[model samples]
Target: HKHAIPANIADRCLINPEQYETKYKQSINDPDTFWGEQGKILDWITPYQKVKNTSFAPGNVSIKWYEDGTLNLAANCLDRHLQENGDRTAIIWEGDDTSQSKHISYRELHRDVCRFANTLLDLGIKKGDVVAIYMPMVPEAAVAMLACARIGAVHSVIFGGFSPEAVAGCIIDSSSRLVITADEGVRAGRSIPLKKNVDDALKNPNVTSVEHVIVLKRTGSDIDWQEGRDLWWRDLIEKASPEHQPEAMNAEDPLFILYTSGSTGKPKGVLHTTGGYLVYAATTFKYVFDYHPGDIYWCTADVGWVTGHSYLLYGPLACGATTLMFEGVPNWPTPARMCQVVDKHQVNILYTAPTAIRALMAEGDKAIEGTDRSSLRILGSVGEPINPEAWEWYWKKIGKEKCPVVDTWWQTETGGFMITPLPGAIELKAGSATRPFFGVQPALVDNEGHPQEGATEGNLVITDSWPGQARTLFGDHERFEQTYFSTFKNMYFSGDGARRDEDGYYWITGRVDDVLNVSGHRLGTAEIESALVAHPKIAEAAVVGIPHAIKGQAIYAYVTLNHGEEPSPELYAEVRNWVRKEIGPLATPDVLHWTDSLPKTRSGKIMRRILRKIAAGDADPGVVEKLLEEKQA
Candidate 1:
């Protein structure tokens, strides 16, 4: 395993050890001045005047960052590669079944992107126009992304598995002018009729903004084509010139709009700008993965999600790194496919979710015994805090206990990994994200916004903003301000509860919003879930807080058992006893339900909002709706 460290860092990226030393000393002491220095590595059509500007207060939030800057995200990611490292592989795309694959070099990718950009221009897509891209993990999908960025148009990518109704909701929200999708997508050896869904989504008579429906023919399914309104991607791009000038967008120009699931109502469109977003993504990629040339990096996340947008696509591409995109499940074809890919591609950096790792852990040593994962130099965990068992298994099995595991903790709203070990700077901890990234001022605060220091457990708040922070909520800046800012006065509320250990490493306890007030004590769902997972019988677990008259909120757990474990009275009692010992008597779940699987998003995050409703006996609306509407058979 190759373990390389970063050299000198710029002053702007420096962390104050004197201030943050007690808790996050390793991160503060490490020479990470390179975080802000890499911002200049990206091609800035117009340079930023100020790199950072703020104090850890503006009410309770960080005052400001990147006061004046100008850069085009397209230039940073695509054009920069063309300028210097044009011959390198930009994206290596694999089909769901791996029967077919495509390799687009950085130079080739630029040509296809330029052609698509011209096609969009030909279709009347202009600056700030919202173009909805609903497609699978394919090279053309990447082409569509660069095409939108080339013209300074904001792209909104909806997950391919989302229902037509869900897709329509995004289209309607963004008021998109064009709908870009493939005829269908392949999943688990079957083709999903994607164009049909797009057609259905746009069938709403009230939807008048969508003037063009551009379809990419992947499955070759015959369909009724709307004459002037719909066009073939191949035909449009083939006829257009493969050379188009890239535009220089403003720093605050909207790069893309991603909608996250809202527990209360419609999904909120979190808006990320060009300059700051690219700076954040690229800087994090360089450090988090300890990126090196010729190294194959894989992040198992859908492009539709923020992880996909930042890690899988823009971040890696911006740094001129080779990234692998998998279109299938980890267990597809065989349980050993991921290991096979790692060995086959010589993947040095593997970034994935804890859910997948836990699933593979069930396969035990057999999943990794024979695979040549010698190329792997770095391992990562994301989406949620990893359990200690899974974390150790990942380190031992995949990393051979040599490579460092960067357990990242961040969300869609935060934009990028805010708290993580800077490559080799900070030592590894099993379930902890360790420390905040450079320029990120994270403080633990109680419900009242007072700083909780010296091994205290409280909500994690960012007392300072970085360049890549989300500018606003689409059409609802007030809601964005109220949700993140007003919560603690000025601090950006993360909605997650965390504990700073005696050594100062932060362990995310779970969401404060997801806390269960049982018997006047605040119990986090994550703490209970972690306790449940520690039990031998449980393979996976999800906990929710349900309505209770006496306790205010009762803890309810949905657990998935291991292959051989039978759900018996003795097993249930054992699980209950484990939770009582691991957390406390009050923290034990009031009721426990064992299922084959828990409701999860396409990205593998537990659908807790739905789980909570199911636990509350709101069967008519909650989990059933998620199952009947979102779950595909």
Candidate 2:
């Protein structure tokens, strides 16, 4: 925590430590002034009438944010950047399988976004229409998103790597009228036939609601085109005019629908509104990542996810920062490819997932050798709570202990960053998100739905509504009420279990359903997994709660050792004792298995639900098959 400021920065930036401290303290208590000042940096096409409004009751799940506001999110992000920083780089794309790549400037990006917006309009798409986009992290992906925002259409981007069934489920659920996809895209050295997959997904007669499919030819793959259904990206864009006007959308209008994983049933369609989402994203971008003008910012998340929606596209551009968008895997040409790109682009602010940081760490220090990552000033960890070991590795190897590491905590439902360190304002803790951002009032509540006493662990709930809170889940308002509102009476339940330390720093444990009970003591699986990974020999681990006769729920762990280590009886005891030391003796895993690899989604998150099924020996054939592949090695 003390190694936050490098000697050079401390001497220059924090020249008067006392004044810096006073300013930091003031920002925390008076966040409206701080955030308002930050929000004023944007060129608002239609300025907001009110900063935020939360007069609705706690039981009112149908809340409205920025009620009197009006602004186009797309125009604020791309249009204004072009007018001011046109020549600056907006995207730096690297392909998955080769050295082929390209860089686009703000002017080029604006033109492309406009052309695509026109293309969508030419296809008869209108405001409020749902445009489903399933594409890899290409520059066109970002363009497609902005294009949707430009025309006031709600873009629902599903992760391209999902199975056809999953993609179909989203399309069918959202009743998407138009789908934008690519002919082909590469991932993990495999060229997935994206258009073909879409065809397979929508081929079912019941899924005919999708009126048209627009395909981008990235790999020159052959496709069967249906009359009046399929369209080419090149032909459509070529015929469309680049000089088009962006529509002015209302503040509470739907911006995008991001699907997040649910405990059961289908994923939830978390809907973020325009004006509030943009303001929250832009304000958080400046303070959370400490965005500097002319600096190259990169968030290594696919555009399909919430991180990409906020950080990669909207947030950075809204701040007029030069954001880099990579089109390839981190280990494409080599494990060191990301570092190479960083060195090549001189990326100033690097934001990525903890899963990626751990994956890169597994590749060894040799992967980072000879790389000049000195351009990196602020490093961020998202997706999940990072293990202390991974946090140390990122701090030492990636940041060189020179940059402040902000462990961001937010969700698709929250819409933007809710809890994070404000640059150098707070001390950096290895596992804690540190503190809540302005406008976010977090409460650690007990099982009875009452606020827990100091330093206790319980359900993490947001006591007050912020501008970026999702207005509602698409169509299923009752489900939204039950899932988020009903659980806490009035507070927006985060579903994640967390702890508040004596110092009031919040540490996210894991999902509420992922909680394990050992003889009446509740434990977060992530805390146990983090403790296990703290052992030098452990590379990765997954912990799940399983039914037990006495304990009600017991902990079961599946771990992958660092390359050469074998499963040993002695090492098992060592791990158990290490976890006891890290958390408590009652939190030890009941069963531990050393496997070659854990089941993971394409996004790199360990699928704990599948692990729980496997541990319980459930007869879920379909789900197990999806999780376990013989080629997982």
Candidate 3:
């Protein structure tokens, strides 16, 4: 059902619907002029005349924006705001338990980041060097990234939940020169062995490029030490000066590399650059969050993911807005933990996932009985295709029906929100990512590359370039072109199915490829299958995604055991446990059916589509019967 924009929200908006349409037209038709003006959001050392320069052509693809400009992202985010409000809180860190509340001002942010940057320089970290950050959802994660940006190192952040193999894979792929990690991480009263995982990852014989490991003391827990290679963070920074000049990086200089899963192969690192990315981040954060000075913002994402990189660090900091970081799970301690934090921090904007919303809604209102969420003005959903029921409950119970639900639709490759409500401009619709933001050109097309128009279902594609779009995949530019552009010649194929409603609002229909979005994290089907095949008992495995209420998509595996290894209760449990050890607990399959054989096409490729149909009960009863029969030991 449609929910029109409220008068109270519109009256307080920085831009109205009338202005949205005007800017949308100019942004699409005359990007050179429009983006030139938008580029003024941040200070530039050298100005540029060129606005957009990119191509999607096969065999020769390149993307560039504001190519002549020179600026420092760390400076724009820190130095520019120092004179006016250096004492303003930059981060509000809420502990896993309610007992701890921490705040860091812009001045402290500047001081910590500069000291850390100088420490990196003292260790011989050069401008183009790559440093891998394996961290939790702590404020130091922000410092690690900003320290990289302060001196021109391209930082690669690996998520905290990944296993040692996954961590080693990314560090090796990036050829990281230095590693930053913590001693331990705590969540829900459980201690995560962060330093131990780093040790396991560095055990790989191929990991020779990394010379030094900077260990942060989080829990003061005992950790194994290696001389000369492992250095303490506190010891190195104790004598380091907190005064350092920001690097003057070109517009096309690499900002950071974020790895993402694809339908095939290992995770590919998506590369985003300096000036264009920061400008887009600043503009989108200001408009999408409807941010104002002194407003507290909270985006429930970790720094390892692109959502956190853009929203939590680059976006809010560039706008000089205070952002909140929570080092806990949504359901742990209690389901009310998130809402109470809102009441505690007086959170102005709340951006989280539908996976979290669904899990909380199942506990009913008593789970959040005493929370006073009147401080919340805008609600947001991301990393998921939100359901109407979840959206309604969030608006009615959590937000008290006054806040607008800004359901955003974007991807790691896009780098920022593509389709959203724009705060006060577009009317809200449950389960719909309504309307394209300024400078985004989205279209619908059929399988044969023919454009679809006026309320139809097809694959989603972006017709042109935007400032926030990733430039290329690290070390594999050709594969990037073949994966995205080859599907729908010359267009940036989204690998997602979508339907344009009669009102032109977009409703995303999950992944069109073999990737699964589980708990708002994208997992490649091939990656899981590879991990499964590594087991001694598994002969073959094919993984598929099925509908899940809480995880959005859950993995269901069809397995064929090795001829010598028989399937027993213990073996079945071991097969599931194997993936957890290999990829971490997130990739653990929910259901495993022992199959005699897997369906394959003429070319011997696994027919995942037929398996998906059988799982969803869309196939014939006889075909489904053959599929569901799992042979016992």
Best by TM-score: 3
Candidate 1: worst-modelled 10 consecutive residues by lDDT: 7-16
Q: What is the lDDT of residue 248 in candidate 1?
A: 72
Better of 1 and 3 by TM-score: 3
Task: Evaluate model 1: give its TM-score.
Answer: 0.78
lDDT of 2 by residue, 228-305 (tens): 889888889989899988777888889899876555444678898887688788878877886667778889888888
Pairs of colliding residues, candidate 3 = none
Candidate 2, run of 10 with poorest lDDT: 8-17
TM-scores, all candidates, are 0.78, 0.80, 0.98
- Native-to-model Cα distance after best TM-score fit, residue 111 in candidate 1, in Å: 0.4
Alpha-carbon lDDT of model 2: 0.77
lDDT for residue 52 in candidate 3, whole number 0-100: 87
For model 2, what is the error of residue 567's alpha carbon versus the real structure, in angstroms, after optimal superposition? 26
Instruction: Give the runs in model 1 whose Cα sits over 4 Å from its true position.
Output: 1-38, 53-67, 514-633
Better of 2 and 3 by lDDT: 3
Q: Positional deviation of 458 in candidate 2, in angstroms?
A: 1.1
Whole-model alpha-carbon lDDT for candidate 1: 0.76
Predicted candidate 3 versus true structure: per-residue lDDT over 1-633, tens digit per residue:
678788877888877889999999999999989999999999888898788898988767789999999999999888888999899999999988879879999999999999999999999998889999999878888998999998889999998888888888989999999999999988888889888999999999988889999999989999999999999989998879999988689999998999899989779999999988998888888898888887899999888899999998999999999999999887787888889999999999999989889989999895478888999999999987988999999888888898998988999899888988887888888999989888899999998999999999899999888999988898889988888889888799988889999999999988888899998989999999999999987889989988887888888898888887777889878988899878888999988877865787667777788788666556122434568554221
